[PDB]
Amino acid sequence: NDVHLTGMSRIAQAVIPAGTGTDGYIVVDETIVPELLPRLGFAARIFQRYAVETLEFEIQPMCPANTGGGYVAGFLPDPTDSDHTFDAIQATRGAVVAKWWESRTIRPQYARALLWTSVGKEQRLTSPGRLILLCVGNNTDVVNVSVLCRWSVRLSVPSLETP
Amino acid sequence: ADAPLAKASTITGFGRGTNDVHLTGMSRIAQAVIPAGTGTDGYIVVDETIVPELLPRLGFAARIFQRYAVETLEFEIQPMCPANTGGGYVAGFLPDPTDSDHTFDAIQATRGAVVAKWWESRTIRPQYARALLWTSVGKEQRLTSPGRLILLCVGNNTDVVNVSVLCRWSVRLSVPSLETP
Amino acid sequence: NDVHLTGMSRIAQAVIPAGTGTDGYIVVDETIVPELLPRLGFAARIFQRYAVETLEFEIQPMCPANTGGGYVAGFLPDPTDSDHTFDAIQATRGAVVAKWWESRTIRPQYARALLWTSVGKEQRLTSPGRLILLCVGNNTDVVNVSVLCRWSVRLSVPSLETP
Amino acid sequence: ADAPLAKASTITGFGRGTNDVHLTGMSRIAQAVIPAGTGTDGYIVVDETIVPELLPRLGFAARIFQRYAVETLEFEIQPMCPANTGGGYVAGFLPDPTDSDHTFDAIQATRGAVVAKWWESRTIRPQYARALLWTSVGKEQRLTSPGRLILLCVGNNTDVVNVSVLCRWSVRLSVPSLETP
Amino acid sequence: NDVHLTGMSRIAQAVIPAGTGTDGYIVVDETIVPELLPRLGFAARIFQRYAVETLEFEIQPMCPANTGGGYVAGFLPDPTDSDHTFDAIQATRGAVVAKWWESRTIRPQYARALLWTSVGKEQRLTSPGRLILLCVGNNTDVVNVSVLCRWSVRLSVPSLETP
């Protein structure tokens, strides 16, 4: 009928050797589809329609304190296929920027419409935006960032997919 | 008075032992060391169930009583290395005393799980079972241990790390007996 | 649906010749399973789950007054397979000790959980403890002890076993 | 906030165990049997010191704590034979844990000593040391055991007697530790 | 007749090269006898009986901040000859644990009886416990710990020893 899930889950993880990662180097650009969240990924294989109530992100990077580069992150509510720059992430509401040893918190501005789980011909009805984390400095040592999520959603209309 | 065939036994208070105790404290669980280079993501540092044996003052006092019920139970991680390490860890608490959960996704999912770098210590406020368990061993594990602690590394540490997890327990042992371990 | 039985029934009976029965000699060690009580044995072949409300024991030994040994009894809420000594029965709540011509009353401390009737892989869910009656003296003549019970239980969830 | 060389260890409650417990109960001390004809006057039936080992639930709980202080301590004799025996006994309690008092005159002299026939049971309300002792063994005996129980026959019994002495103890173990016996 | 001394004094000092000192490695295990404290050592060669009023310890380790091991300490009021482990120090009241660059404060639970100064056949009457400081990590560089004390005592009954 109608549920209300919470959770906290890894979205993605990337590793960067030294020398790589000038300004504008995209570390991770992935849309918020149910296939990426693990516990919602098993729960959106049941239902059909969900609507996010609150949704927040944390970056949680892991490097020694002698790194001396930095990152920027944001949340773009166009799930298009072209925003690869610093200035699109500058404009948005709830963006963060810090050095590589510091964790910050993205409090985005989502859509609060009512979406679908499966794929379709239109992209705007199945994912409420994109996360983009791109390096702004030029790092010294190997970093290892591990972005988290904090999702709360209200899945309904029971079915079953065959992915 | 006069003299019968046998006077009755005057053992008055027989089998009237103590009933309710409250033991608290803090004791470690386990401790390991990892050389440099070893310890990629998913490498299990420590996985030891909370049986009353690993808490040492409780295990000498649960050999008397039969049943215990954990009132408050918290954990502290305390890694020991300078701020030039740069790997990380993830800690959790899984109330299954089963034998297959070895991934980052299972540990992050539970309630009150933490993740931090090797030069930073965190604190677990877990979701324990709050039931009333047994002390002696048996065939089924789900009645004698309120879960497992699993701690595993997530990065690739640079120097030698040295973690030492602890445990702040409080319990209310009752129903007196004495067993043989 | 839900019943409430009472009763009073023989658990076991043993006989001891002269010379036998030093201290620590087990006369009867049997768990409280429904197969031992007679009227509950016919009634727990119907239902599946029972929960004891009140349960008490009496020893009722029968010997002439020139016996001059004694016994101890108790109730151990571990239905394990190893407690054969005096000191495990010493510790428990509601133990008794008297000479062979005297009856005493065990008022135990049971579990008040909700158990099963049939057998299973785990022993703790099918029997709320053990009765142990062991001689503490070194008797003179032939005794004949006959322990009783006084059980009250609330059987439910109807089925039928095939023992 | 900013990033230092090493964050301080946040182990908050370390070494804050329980302090005061009160254990009571009843447990036997020893038990013997005497054939007919044996057991003239002065024959020692039972002579065993009250070390915490002979009380079995206390000995599994004094392996934690360091010091105990006996609050109340009483004894019950309970012989088992019919009224055709006609010998006797004498019971006492000597607060020396030494090793030479084997006569009727030493046992009758103490406070709260009893004497009766074999078909009658009595009760000892002794004069214990009421100090604050230790639990582990050492060179000196006078700091770890609050006296001895000595019971010996006084007549010449006719049939087989069978005595079974008991002990009603209550104690207040404290100052937590853990030893190795 | 009766005095009241205070003070602050070195108990012991040890040095540990790199590689040595795994978990359970005893750095210093010495009883609190008057022969170890310096100012009380000259004052307990006068009198015979003392009784500690307040007595506290500090660890004061000295190493660069890149050490990354740690220690544990405590106070065991058995002056026996066998407690060499972590778990005996875990149980006691007023134990401390920190990394090698950090000083902590032991506030023990002593005996407050009235003791002797000289040696004797029994150990329990001449020393109110033991200090045990043992490494719990596996250190990187050379540390140099220097434990202190803070003793206050009330010596009496004048005599003179010949050690």
Residue numbers in the entry:
A (entry chain B), C (entry chain B), E (entry chain B): 52 to 214
B (entry chain C), D (entry chain C): 34 to 214
Text from the published report:
Nervous necrosis virus is a member of the family Nodaviridae that contains two genera: Alphanodavirus, which usually infects insects, and Betanodavirus, also known as piscine nodavirus. Virions of the Nodaviridae, including NNV, are non-enveloped, 25–30 nm in diameter and contain 180 copies of a single type of coat protein subunit arranged with T = 3 symmetry. The coat protein precursor self-assembles into T = 3 provirions. Provirions mature by spontaneous autocatalytic cleavage of the coat protein alpha post-assembly, producing proteins beta (38 kDa) and gamma (5 kDa) which remain part of the mature virion.
Here, we show that both transient expression of the coat protein of Atlantic cod nervous necrosis virus (ACNNV) in Nicotiana benthamiana leaves or in transgenic tobacco BY-2 cells leads to the production of VLPs. For a detailed structural analysis of the plant- produced ACNNV VLPs, cryo-EM was performed on the sample prepared from N. benthamiana leaves. Single-particle image processing was carried out in Relion, which allowed us to determine the solution structure of the VLP to a global resolution of 3.7 Å. The ACNNV VLP is an isometric particle with T = 3 symmetry, consistent with previously reported structures of the grouper nervous necrosis virus (GNNV) VLPs which share ∼85 % sequence identity. The shell domain displays the highest local resolution which allowed the building of an atomic model of the capsid shell. The viral asymmetric unit is composed of three quasi equivalent copies of the coat protein which have a characteristic jelly roll topology, with clear side-chain density. Three P-domains of the capsid protein interact and form spikes on the particle surface. The P-domains are attached to the rest of the capsid protein by a linker region and display lower local resolution, presumably as a result of flexibility. Overall, the cryo-EM analysis confirmed that the structure of the plant-produced VLPs is very similar that of material produced in other expression systems. When administered either intraperitoneally or intramuscularly to sea bass, the VLPs were shown to confer partial protection against subsequent challenge with ACNNV, indicating that plants can be used to produce effective vaccines for use in aquaculture.
